Amino acid sequence: PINDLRSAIALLQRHPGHYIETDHPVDPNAELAGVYRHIGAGGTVKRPTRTGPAMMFNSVKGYPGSRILVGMHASRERAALLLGCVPSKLAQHVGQAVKNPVAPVVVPASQAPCQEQVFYADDPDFDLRKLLPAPTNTPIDAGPFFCLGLVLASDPEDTSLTDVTIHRLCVQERDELSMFLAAGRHIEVFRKKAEAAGKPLPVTINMGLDPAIYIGACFEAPTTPFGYNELGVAGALRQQPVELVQGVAVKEKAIARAEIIIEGELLPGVRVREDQHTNTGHAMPEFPGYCGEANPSLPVIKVKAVTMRNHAILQTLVGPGEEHTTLAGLPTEASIRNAVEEAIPGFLQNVYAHTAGGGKFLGILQVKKRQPSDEGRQGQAALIALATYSELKNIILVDEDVDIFDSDDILWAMTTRMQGDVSITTLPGIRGHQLDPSQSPDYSTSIRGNGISCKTIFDCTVPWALKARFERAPFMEVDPTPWAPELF
Amino acid sequence: NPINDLRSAIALLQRHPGHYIETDHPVDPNAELAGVYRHIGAGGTVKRPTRTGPAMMFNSVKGYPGSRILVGMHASRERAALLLGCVPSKLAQHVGQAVKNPVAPVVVPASQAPCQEQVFYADDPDFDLRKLLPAPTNTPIDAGPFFCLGLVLASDPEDTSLTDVTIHRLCVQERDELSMFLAAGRHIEVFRKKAEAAGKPLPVTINMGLDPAIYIGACFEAPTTPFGYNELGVAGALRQQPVELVQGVAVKEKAIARAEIIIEGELLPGVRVREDQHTNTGHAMPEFPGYCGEANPSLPVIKVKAVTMRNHAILQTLVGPGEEHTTLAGLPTEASIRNAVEEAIPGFLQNVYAHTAGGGKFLGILQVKKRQPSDEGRQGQAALIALATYSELKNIILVDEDVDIFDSDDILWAMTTRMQGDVSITTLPGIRGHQLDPSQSPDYSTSIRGNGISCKTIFDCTVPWALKARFERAPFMEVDPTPWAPELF
């Protein structure tokens, strides 16, 4: 079975094409990301690019004994393989585990591989910049970045309330990182509580994990006493609870079977400019495919210790490309699937949070009109999708005979099953997302501020009265394996 | 002093003058009855002149001595709020709070079942439902006499632990037969299909004359628990006292113990009737949008086995259905819309009104408060959530927190001074709405592909965030005007 990063790699090695290694040296500064751009970054990264194998870089220039791993989640086919289900049913699969979680468990340090090696910060030869090779994606980033930091944090007033989230961090000093916290998230509430009292907030950055943890943590989870409830998804996906170990130097727990763990605390009453040492004005590439701007006021994490297993694998991403599409798009598809199935049972067939929108901006809904009254319900499904995921932008509606994962087949529906003065409904002035650069008053007079957009529903479904005229050419059902065994 | 039935609720209304009256003037239950209350308290989408007023008891029914007919009990938001102990603006919240912590019903012996103080078995050859109950007709073109507030209890004919309680309307067809429509996809309809498949009837009880808490709570979405009857849990929570149930006398189903009248019958398999078979008016009844509905051609028949009522049983129904429908339908509408927006955008939606001009279903008024620049653009998000939550909505109007969403004058004011027709109006064609809107027809629009499909419109009458400083309503000094006119307060 799988219970950490390395056992997942073993499964990938039994399916050739999903994992490779290389011993040719590489620079973690921009060179690594530039290489994986051609191999497996995918997503919204500039062409040429493609989905490919997960990649391991064994020779890291300037970091002997370190190995960097990227693209673990940069493939919907790979992600379904890691959880054991069909790719088209992957969101439905994880959504089922969301509804029947398996709570994590605390285990002693003897069962925590993540603490085989310990490095305290108060040691005078400790330097976070020499201990870990944090890669940069572009030569214009704010600095070195960790992009897959599973952050654990508890309320300082009541430890029974926790939060499990994925963050990115920029290495600033030998013992400091900058970390943005989304306003409204529980951990940001926890941090403002501690900063209001002048106290730091202990946290753990857990990196190099079972893919089931990274994916499952992106879903919304209920709350239970001493919860860490986001981990319950991975517990249900593996039918084995996720094990936790007490931190070595902070009053917070950590993933026991993690590759690397940074223990630190959010400092009270201190901010930092994200690119203070590079002065590029930017932070790093964002999921829409453009370079985000450097945040001028970020809170600082003061590192206390770094614990890692022997021959620790540093896991991060590149792009963020298809990797971000997987981690954000599966929750997007799941919450839309639940909302529509609740409102219109048996109508929605599937949903794809398209990788062209990073799994956030573009939603493709596949419906099936079973009866005359289903005409008019496709627009209802699009309204439900927009209402469930406010950060969406455009919705495309197609029938069950369209493959929503094939963008050629989507454009085909836009071509032969659509009239621009009939099938296109615009919705101006709806709050969308700040990182879409076209959501600007400079782009449209109907946009009153940044992050507001026009939202468009493309109804490429066949009108119920005409479905007999739109049957695709019916080729005979055959098994092509005998005529070309090598292709199957 | 507490409320546990219809008569204890009437007693509370009598302590608040203006909400209940009686009359001893003889009234004809055929048309004349509804025609009178149209002027007095029908309200809603009833054709003018009309208004909301007191609930009304007609003690003198022509041809029915000893009968007394009750209408208008829920025909007022103030009256409903008083009947539940809260302010009318927070009425949807107060019930939604009780929905989340229901109190389960309890079965009791016939000793504690006032509803069974009288029993009329249908096997008597002189039995006649027409002689027994004076079911009124709302208009002269109705399909026949109607019961409009029948709380129906039913259970799965296979797994009796699965129950469903709902509100239906029933048309009197014979001395022992009623026609009753059932909405597809609901549990009681699925229960009837299983029974009809095996050639077996389905036992039901029709409970009429209830605590308003029961009628109101039954319209909300309830969970399902073993032998739960969960829609009754809202009323039990609203009274902090469980609803009492009594085993049926002639059929295999329980009934409301504190009810005024009970009809015990069975849904006969295979048999079908058209609603207007005895009248041929082509119509059924006035519907909530304000028009007379068409007669249903194929309706399942309820064969009554026993009628059960207390001494001097009050016959409760509605007229219009007017404001009475707006209350029963609009409170669930507002509650679910409020829950959906508060989850998605906390602290943004201030209130919501399922406007009575929409019958509590077609028109939604949303009161939002823009607190920060990021709130600009979320008002349309709030409208999309409501449309997604209640698909039978047609139009949405967005207003700010300084607009009284229950004052239609104030709504048209926001639509006059806080709106530009080429900026603030978003049309959404081809969205299924509701069959009873007559404009949802291909004959009304070329963008409508079939009956029940509509264009849905969002009127954004909120002040743009950047201009809010220019749209402050005139600030009048806050005073307590009681000493200057104590008779008005």
Side-chain angles (χ1 to χ4, degrees):
Chain A
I2 299 175
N3 66 344
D4 48 36
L5 175 59
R6 295 175 180 182
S7 37
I9 296 184
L11 180 145
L12 294 188
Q13 288 168 330
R14 286 179 273 169
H15 299 75
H18 282 278
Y19 178 83
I20 66 171
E21 296 195 10
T22 179
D23 291 317
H24 186 71
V26 76
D27 192 342
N29 189 16
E31 174 167 86
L32 196 159
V35 170
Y36 195 55
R37 175 261 195 95
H38 299 268
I39 292 181
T44 57
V45 178
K46 181 182 185 172
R47 272 54 177 169
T49 179
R50 64 184 288 265
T51 42
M55 192 156 176
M56 183 79 63
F57 295 77
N58 293 327
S59 182
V60 187
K61 293 184 187 178
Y63 294 88
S66 286
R67 43 180 179 168
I68 300 177
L69 161 82
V70 296
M72 191 60 75
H73 317 86
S75 177
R76 188 191 189 92
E77 192 160 277
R78 168 153 62 259
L81 185 59
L82 294 164
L83 316 180
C85 62
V86 176
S88 75
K89 279 192 168 65
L90 173 56
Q92 179 232 44
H93 181 86
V94 185
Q96 206 72 20
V98 167
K99 295 169 180 176
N100 305 91
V102 175
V105 70
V106 176
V107 301
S110 49
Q111 292 188 37
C114 64
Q115 295 186 159
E116 291 168 353
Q117 307 182 216
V118 178
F119 303 95
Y120 282 97
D122 53 337
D123 182 277
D125 299 337
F126 174 87
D127 188 351
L128 190 61
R129 296 157 303 188
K130 307 169 105 68
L131 181 60
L132 286 179
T136 68
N137 276 259
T138 63
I140 67 167
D141 294 339
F145 263 100
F146 297 107
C147 300
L148 283 171
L150 204 259
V151 176
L152 260 54
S154 303
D155 190 306
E157 287 186 350
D158 180 19
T159 320
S160 63
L161 308 127
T162 72
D163 186 45
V164 177
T165 42
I166 296 181
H167 294 243
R168 71 188 189 192
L169 300 92
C170 185
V171 189
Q172 307 284 350
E173 303 294 334
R174 55 172 288 277
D175 56 347
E176 288 182 355
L177 304 120
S178 51
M179 191 180 71
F180 168 80
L181 294 85
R185 271 319 295 246
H186 273 130
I187 181 177
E188 171 64 18
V189 168
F190 300 160
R191 189 199 61 83
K192 296 220 285 181
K193 269 201 178 78
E195 194 176 42
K199 317 278 188 56
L201 183 74
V203 294
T204 54
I205 299 94
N206 305 272
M207 304 173 292
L209 321 170
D210 184 354
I213 296 181
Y214 275 120
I215 299 171
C218 294
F219 290 68
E220 294 289 74
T223 313
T224 67
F226 287 111
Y228 301 98
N229 304 90
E230 291 82 1
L231 310 174
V233 186
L237 288 174
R238 301 307 189 200
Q239 286 302 288
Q240 187 78 17
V242 179
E243 301 174 358
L244 303 170
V245 61
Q246 179 71 21
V248 154
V250 295
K251 293 182 58 185
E252 182 57 64
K253 307 165 192 64
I255 308 298
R257 304 197 58 81
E259 287 291 322
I260 311 178
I261 286 172
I262 300 183
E263 302 190 12
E265 48 197 39
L266 291 158
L267 253 26
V270 60
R271 297 297 182 273
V272 71
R273 169 155 55 90
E274 191 165 10
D275 69 326
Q276 60 172 356
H277 302 303
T278 53
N279 283 318
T280 70
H282 299 94
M284 71 165 272
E286 313 283 345
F287 66 92
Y290 307 92
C291 259
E293 72 178 4
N295 190 312
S297 184
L298 283 179
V300 174
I301 285 191
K302 195 67 170 181
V303 177
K304 301 302 180 185
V306 179
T307 80
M308 69 186 78
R309 30 204 296 179
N310 296 311
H311 210 199
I313 299 174
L314 177 56
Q315 190 179 11
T316 185
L317 49 77
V318 165
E322 185 75 2
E323 195 128 39
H324 183 290
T325 295
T326 301
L327 297 180
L330 266 31
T332 297
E333 295 165 27
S335 54
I336 292 166
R337 211 203 84 96
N338 298 343
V340 178
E341 194 64 32
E342 210 211 73
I344 326 179
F347 180 63
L348 185 65
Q349 297 306 115
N350 211 340
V351 56
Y352 174 38
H354 207 282
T355 188
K360 290 175 74 66
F361 290 171
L362 174 50
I364 317 291
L365 277 58
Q366 186 187 55
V367 306
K368 169 169 183 166
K369 298 178 190 169
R370 315 144 289 182
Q371 56 205 336
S373 60
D374 281 339
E375 185 55 50
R377 299 217 166 100
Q378 67 272 29
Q380 181 62 27
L383 292 172
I384 296 167
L386 289 179
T388 304
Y389 204 79
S390 73
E391 297 179 331
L392 275 166
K393 182 170 179 178
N394 302 329
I395 297 293
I396 303 187
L397 308 169
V398 296
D399 294 284
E400 66 281 13
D401 62 342
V402 175
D403 182 12
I404 61 180
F405 303 96
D406 187 343
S407 289
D408 277 8
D409 219 34
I410 306 175
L411 291 175
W412 171 83
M414 311 217 73
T415 292
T416 62
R417 297 173 167 191
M418 223 209 62
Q419 287 292 336
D421 57 347
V422 173
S423 308
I424 307 185
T425 302
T426 52
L427 295 88
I430 311 297
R431 166 69 57 189
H433 199 284
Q434 276 282 342
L435 292 175
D436 184 352
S438 72
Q439 302 191 14
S440 174
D442 304 318
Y443 218 97
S444 170
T445 56
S446 57
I447 296 184
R448 299 171 178 176
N450 297 128
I452 310 185
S453 177
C454 176
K455 305 208 175 180
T456 319
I457 299 172
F458 299 94
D459 176 18
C460 312
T461 63
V462 180
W464 167 262
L466 316 174
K467 299 194 75 177
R469 305 190 202 175
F470 286 76
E471 203 211 340
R472 302 183 79 160
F475 290 97
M476 180 178 250
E477 173 191 42
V478 305
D479 189 345
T481 316
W483 290 273
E486 308 83 353
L487 311 178
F488 306 96
Chain B
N1 211 34
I3 300 188
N4 57 18
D5 51 23
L6 174 59
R7 298 186 191 192
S8 35
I10 296 178
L12 175 57
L13 299 188
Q14 288 166 324
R15 300 202 288 275
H16 297 263
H19 283 281
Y20 178 85
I21 67 170
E22 297 182 357
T23 175
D24 305 292
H25 201 249
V27 71
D28 199 334
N30 187 17
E32 164 165 275
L33 187 37
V36 170
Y37 195 54
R38 171 234 185 155
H39 297 278
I40 288 171
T45 60
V46 176
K47 182 198 174 180
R48 272 52 177 167
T50 180
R51 58 169 175 260
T52 56
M56 195 162 181
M57 179 79 69
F58 292 80
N59 286 324
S60 176
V61 184
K62 296 179 185 177
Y64 290 86
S67 283
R68 45 178 181 176
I69 300 181
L70 183 60
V71 296
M73 197 59 37
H74 321 96
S76 162
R77 176 178 268 255
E78 281 77 27
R79 169 146 72 258
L82 170 62
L83 285 167
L84 306 177
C86 64
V87 302
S89 64
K90 300 181 178 187
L91 179 54
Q93 168 175 36
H94 184 265
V95 179
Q97 174 76 353
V99 173
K100 298 175 180 55
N101 306 261
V103 173
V106 171
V107 303
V108 301
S111 173
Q112 284 180 283
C115 75
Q116 294 184 351
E117 287 168 359
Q118 301 181 238
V119 173
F120 292 80
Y121 294 103
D123 47 24
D124 187 288
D126 295 319
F127 178 85
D128 191 347
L129 201 48
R130 287 85 133 257
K131 306 182 193 297
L132 205 46
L133 301 175
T137 68
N138 270 256
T139 68
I141 68 173
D142 285 11
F146 261 100
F147 302 102
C148 298
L149 292 175
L151 183 77
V152 178
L153 310 185
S155 291
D156 191 321
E158 297 185 351
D159 193 342
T160 311
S161 62
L162 301 168
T163 66
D164 186 41
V165 339
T166 38
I167 301 188
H168 308 249
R169 66 183 182 189
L170 295 87
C171 181
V172 176
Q173 303 294 344
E174 306 290 345
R175 48 152 275 192
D176 58 347
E177 298 178 7
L178 302 155
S179 62
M180 164 165 149
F181 172 80
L182 290 83
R186 201 110 168 111
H187 293 4
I188 184 181
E189 172 69 7
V190 169
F191 296 165
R192 201 210 88 268
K193 261 286 186 171
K194 299 181 181 178
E196 187 172 29
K200 288 289 299 183
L202 186 67
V204 294
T205 70
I206 307 153
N207 308 259
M208 303 177 300
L210 318 169
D211 190 347
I214 297 185
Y215 272 130
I216 294 171
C219 298
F220 288 73
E221 270 294 333
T224 291
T225 65
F227 291 90
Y229 301 95
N230 302 89
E231 292 87 298
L232 299 177
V234 190
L238 285 156
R239 304 304 188 191
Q240 287 299 100
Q241 181 73 26
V243 179
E244 292 166 18
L245 300 175
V246 52
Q247 181 62 32
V249 158
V251 299
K252 304 292 182 299
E253 193 54 75
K254 295 129 189 168
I256 299 298
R258 303 290 285 173
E260 286 282 327
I261 306 184
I262 306 295
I263 302 181
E264 296 182 7
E266 293 170 1
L267 287 150
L268 307 184
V271 71
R272 291 302 153 100
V273 75
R274 66 181 182 92
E275 213 160 0
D276 63 333
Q277 60 161 346
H278 296 288
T279 53
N280 298 331
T281 61
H283 301 113
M285 226 197 91
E287 304 292 343
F288 72 91
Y291 312 89
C292 11
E294 63 174 13
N296 192 314
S298 181
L299 274 183
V301 168
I302 281 193
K303 192 87 165 183
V304 55
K305 298 303 177 182
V307 186
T308 274
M309 56 189 251
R310 22 164 98 199
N311 292 339
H312 203 202
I314 299 169
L315 182 51
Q316 178 178 15
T317 187
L318 49 73
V319 172
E323 191 78 15
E324 195 139 23
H325 184 285
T326 296
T327 294
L328 298 179
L331 288 177
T333 305
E334 302 167 9
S336 55
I337 292 175
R338 169 175 302 191
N339 296 333
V341 183
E342 191 61 29
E343 183 217 73
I345 324 173
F348 187 57
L349 189 67
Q350 305 306 304
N351 209 340
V352 49
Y353 178 24
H355 200 291
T356 182
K361 297 167 75 64
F362 290 173
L363 176 51
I365 321 297
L366 269 62
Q367 190 184 49
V368 300
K369 180 183 182 187
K370 294 173 188 170
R371 317 147 292 181
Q372 41 187 343
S374 57
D375 278 336
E376 182 57 49
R378 302 205 169 108
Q379 68 269 31
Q381 185 64 33
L384 297 176
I385 296 171
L387 288 168
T389 306
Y390 203 83
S391 62
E392 287 164 346
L393 276 162
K394 186 174 178 185
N395 295 321
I396 300 297
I397 296 176
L398 306 161
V399 299
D400 296 293
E401 68 278 26
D402 64 343
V403 172
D404 186 22
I405 66 176
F406 301 93
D407 189 340
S408 296
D409 284 352
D410 220 19
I411 298 178
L412 294 173
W413 172 82
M415 290 221 273
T416 287
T417 72
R418 290 175 170 182
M419 218 210 62
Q420 287 291 338
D422 59 350
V423 177
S424 321
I425 305 184
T426 298
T427 52
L428 296 79
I431 314 297
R432 176 153 308 273
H434 200 296
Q435 294 268 345
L436 286 179
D437 184 345
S439 71
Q440 299 195 14
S441 169
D443 307 325
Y444 214 105
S445 171
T446 54
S447 58
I448 296 179
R449 284 163 185 179
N451 292 335
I453 308 177
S454 176
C455 177
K456 306 197 174 188
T457 308
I458 302 175
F459 297 87
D460 178 21
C461 305
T462 69
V463 181
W465 165 263
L467 311 182
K468 292 176 74 67
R470 293 194 239 160
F471 284 78
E472 211 231 296
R473 302 183 80 161
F476 290 91
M477 174 175 170
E478 303 296 339
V479 300
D480 179 20
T482 316
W484 286 276
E487 306 80 21
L488 302 179
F489 312 108

